[PDB]
Motif scaffolding. Structure first.
Motif, PDB file in Angstrom:
ATOM      1  N   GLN A 105      81.971  36.841  19.771  1.00  0.00           N
ATOM      2  CA  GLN A 105      81.994  36.610  21.206  1.00  0.00           C
ATOM      3  C   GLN A 105      80.918  37.469  21.857  1.00  0.00           C
ATOM      4  O   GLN A 105      80.330  38.346  21.202  1.00  0.00           O
ATOM      5  N   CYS A 106      80.669  37.219  23.147  1.00  0.00           N
ATOM      6  CA  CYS A 106      79.724  38.010  23.926  1.00  0.00           C
ATOM      7  C   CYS A 106      80.380  39.367  24.187  1.00  0.00           C
ATOM      8  O   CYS A 106      81.529  39.408  24.619  1.00  0.00           O
ATOM      9  N   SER A 107      79.680  40.481  23.921  1.00  0.00           N
ATOM     10  CA  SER A 107      80.298  41.795  24.139  1.00  0.00           C
ATOM     11  C   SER A 107      80.477  42.101  25.640  1.00  0.00           C
ATOM     12  O   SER A 107      81.222  43.016  25.974  1.00  0.00           O
ATOM     13  N   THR A 108      79.809  41.353  26.532  1.00  0.00           N
ATOM     14  CA  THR A 108      79.900  41.590  27.980  1.00  0.00           C
ATOM     15  C   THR A 108      81.074  40.798  28.606  1.00  0.00           C
ATOM     16  O   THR A 108      82.019  41.404  29.107  1.00  0.00           O
ATOM     17  N   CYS A 109      81.004  39.464  28.589  1.00  0.00           N
ATOM     18  CA  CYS A 109      82.032  38.602  29.200  1.00  0.00           C
ATOM     19  C   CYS A 109      83.221  38.287  28.278  1.00  0.00           C
ATOM     20  O   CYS A 109      84.230  37.776  28.759  1.00  0.00           O
ATOM     21  N   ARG A 110      83.083  38.531  26.951  1.00  0.00           N
ATOM     22  CA  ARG A 110      84.120  38.310  25.936  1.00  0.00           C
ATOM     23  C   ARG A 110      84.426  36.813  25.695  1.00  0.00           C
ATOM     24  O   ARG A 110      85.440  36.505  25.074  1.00  0.00           O
ATOM     25  N   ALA A 112      83.295  32.984  23.927  1.00  0.00           N
ATOM     26  CA  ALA A 112      82.635  32.491  22.715  1.00  0.00           C
ATOM     27  C   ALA A 112      81.373  31.696  23.139  1.00  0.00           C
ATOM     28  O   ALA A 112      81.246  30.503  22.865  1.00  0.00           O
ATOM     29  N   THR A 113      80.453  32.373  23.855  1.00  0.00           N
ATOM     30  CA  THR A 113      79.252  31.785  24.463  1.00  0.00           C
ATOM     31  C   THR A 113      77.999  32.518  24.041  1.00  0.00           C
ATOM     32  O   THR A 113      76.921  32.268  24.591  1.00  0.00           O
ATOM     33  N   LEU A 114      78.133  33.424  23.066  1.00  0.00           N
ATOM     34  CA  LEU A 114      76.978  34.163  22.607  1.00  0.00           C
ATOM     35  C   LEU A 114      76.281  33.438  21.462  1.00  0.00           C
ATOM     36  O   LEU A 114      76.848  33.315  20.373  1.00  0.00           O
ATOM     37  N   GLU A 135      71.955  35.623  22.934  1.00  0.00           N
ATOM     38  CA  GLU A 135      71.884  35.339  24.351  1.00  0.00           C
ATOM     39  C   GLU A 135      73.145  34.614  24.787  1.00  0.00           C
ATOM     40  O   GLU A 135      73.586  33.658  24.140  1.00  0.00           O
ATOM     41  N   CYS A 136      73.770  35.129  25.839  1.00  0.00           N
ATOM     42  CA  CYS A 136      74.978  34.511  26.364  1.00  0.00           C
ATOM     43  C   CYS A 136      74.609  33.280  27.187  1.00  0.00           C
ATOM     44  O   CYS A 136      73.671  33.331  27.978  1.00  0.00           O
ATOM     45  N   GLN A 137      75.323  32.168  26.962  1.00  0.00           N
ATOM     46  CA  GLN A 137      75.094  30.886  27.636  1.00  0.00           C
ATOM     47  C   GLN A 137      75.880  30.741  28.944  1.00  0.00           C
ATOM     48  O   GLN A 137      75.665  29.774  29.688  1.00  0.00           O
ATOM     49  N   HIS A 140      74.751  33.332  34.487  1.00  0.00           N
ATOM     50  CA  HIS A 140      74.420  34.663  34.985  1.00  0.00           C
ATOM     51  C   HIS A 140      74.937  35.837  34.116  1.00  0.00           C
ATOM     52  O   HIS A 140      74.716  36.995  34.499  1.00  0.00           O
ATOM     53  N   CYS A 141      75.533  35.579  32.920  1.00  0.00           N
ATOM     54  CA  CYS A 141      75.903  36.721  32.081  1.00  0.00           C
ATOM     55  C   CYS A 141      74.639  37.266  31.400  1.00  0.00           C
ATOM     56  O   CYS A 141      73.911  36.509  30.754  1.00  0.00           O
ATOM     57  N   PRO A 142      74.342  38.570  31.552  1.00  0.00           N
ATOM     58  CA  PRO A 142      73.113  39.116  30.946  1.00  0.00           C
ATOM     59  C   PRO A 142      73.318  39.550  29.491  1.00  0.00           C
ATOM     60  O   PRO A 142      72.401  40.105  28.877  1.00  0.00           O
TER      61      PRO A 142
HETATM   62 ZN   LIG Z   1      78.460  36.794  28.190  1.00  0.00          ZN
END
Ligand SMILES: [Zn+2]
Ligand SMILES: [Cl-]
Ligand SMILES: [Zn+2]
Ligand SMILES: [Zn+2]
Ligand SMILES: [Zn+2]
Ligand SMILES: [Zn+2]
Ligand SMILES: [Zn+2]
Ligand SMILES: [Zn+2]
Ligand SMILES: [Zn+2]
Length: 384
Positions: A105-110, A112-114, A135-137, A140-142
């Protein structure tokens, strides 16, 4: 003859045996006494298992010998040809070691978009925080870092239902023999000694439980309490202490109390012998009558039996095979695309292949030869 039996305790109770008593008959005595099925007991003497058909004479057990009885049924059935790369300790409902499911998963938003730059190829890639980029899809998640997690693979799990990964445990596809029992078993635990000595999980349980009973765990200042390679290899203490959870709830709880028990003993204290209340007691240094009290029977401090006046009863309380050790060492090309049949070389540990041919570009699993999917990803994303 009197032998001492240590069962889930550092205190060994006396058992009367004769030269002709079999180990199976000794197990029957302890089974009825403890209310535990006989076929679940294992007898260990000087770090080695004693077989059911052997007599006390065959075992060379002498007066006052200490044996361990550990509750762990022998299970012959296993999966030597398993496809899974990972193992976790499922703390509910399995309450044991199970094949794991690897997810990201994305470590920022958590979410499954990474989208990973590249797939993981080793344990470091999935255990070390922020080691893998992407890169998160999500709008606006960086997010640029991957966060991997594992779940039990034996039943469905929610996206929050994680289980701890057991980095030392591996599918024994190399058919390496166990250092203690010399059997070919799967999975195995690999010690981090220079020789990378292999132990089956049955032997690892017996090793830990007898070492809890003998109070032979090693204290490391920057680690806590652990065990080294069974061969006594230097710099081989288990660092990932969550591996002791594989002993099950009862034994892991004994391991968790080890430190508090050791502190009491260091201050001249004593541990209560009664099965159930094995608390760290601090009585008066010269007092023989020790009564259980923080927050149950009165025992004699010398013999550890129920408090009596007068004399105590007359009755009162390892090397690995060189060739087995050498054999138990863990570390001692091209495939066609399933669609266009053009051969390709696997560059590293990652099982996720992508055909470089412009008209094909099929994504596939190196091991299965099928189109890449969530099952292959979860079960064997990389080779171990
Ligand atoms: Zn994200
Ligand atoms: Cl694992
Ligand atoms: Zn489970
Ligand atoms: Zn073994
Ligand atoms: Zn070793
Ligand atoms: Zn007590
Ligand atoms: Zn006594
Ligand atoms: Zn192709
Ligand atoms: Zn596969």
């Amino acid at each position: 003859m009197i032998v001492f039996v240590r069962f889930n305790s550092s205190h060994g109770f006396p058992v009367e045996v004769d030269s002709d008593t079999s180990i199976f008959q000794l197990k029957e005595v302890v089974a009825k006494r403890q209310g535990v099925p006989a076929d679940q007991l294992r007898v260990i003497f000087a770090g080695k298992e004693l077989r059911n058909d052997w007599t006390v004479q065959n075992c060379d057990l002498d007066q006052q010998s200490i044996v361990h009885i550990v509750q762990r049924p022998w299970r012959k059935g296993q999966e030597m040809n398993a496809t899974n790369s990972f193992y976790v300790y499922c703390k509910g409902p399995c309450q044991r070691v199970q094949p794991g499911k690897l997810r990201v998963q994305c470590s920022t938003c958590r979410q499954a978009t990474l989208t990973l730059t590249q797939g993981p190829s080793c344990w470091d890639d999935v255990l070390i925080p922020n080691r893998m980029s992407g890169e998160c899809q999500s709008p606006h998640c960086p997010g640029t870092s991957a966060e991997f997690f594992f779940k039990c693979g034996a039943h469905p799990t929610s996206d929050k239902e994680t289980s701890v990964a057991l980095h030392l445990i591996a599918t024994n596809s190399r058919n390496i023999t166990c250092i203690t029992c010399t059997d070919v078993r799967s999975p195995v635990l690999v010690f981090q000694c220079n020789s990378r000595h292999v132990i089956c999980l049955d032997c690892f349980h017996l090793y830990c439980v007898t070492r809890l009973n003998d109070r032979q765990f090693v204290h490391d200042p920057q680690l806590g309490y652990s065990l080294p390679c069974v061969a006594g290899c230097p710099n081989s203490l288990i660092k990932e202490l969550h591996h002791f959870r594989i002993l099950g709830e009862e034994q892991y709880n004994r391991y968790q109390q080890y430190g508090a028990e050791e502190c009491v003993l260091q201050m001249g204290g004593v541990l209560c012998p009664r099965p159930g209340c094995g608390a760290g007691l601090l009585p008066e240094p010269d007092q023989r009558k020790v009564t259980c009290e923080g927050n149950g029977f009165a025992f004699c401090r010398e013999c550890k039996e129920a408090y009596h006046e007068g004399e105590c009863s007359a009755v009162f309380e390892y090397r690995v095979d060189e060739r087995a050790a050498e054999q138990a060492r863990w570390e001692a090309t091209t495939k066609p695309c399933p669609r266009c049949h053009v051969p390709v070389e696997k560059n590293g540990g990652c099982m996720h292949m992508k055909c470089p041919q412009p008209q094909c570009r099929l994504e596939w699993c190196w091991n299965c030869g099928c189109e890449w999917n969530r099952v292959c990803m979860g079960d064997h994303w990389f080779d171990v």
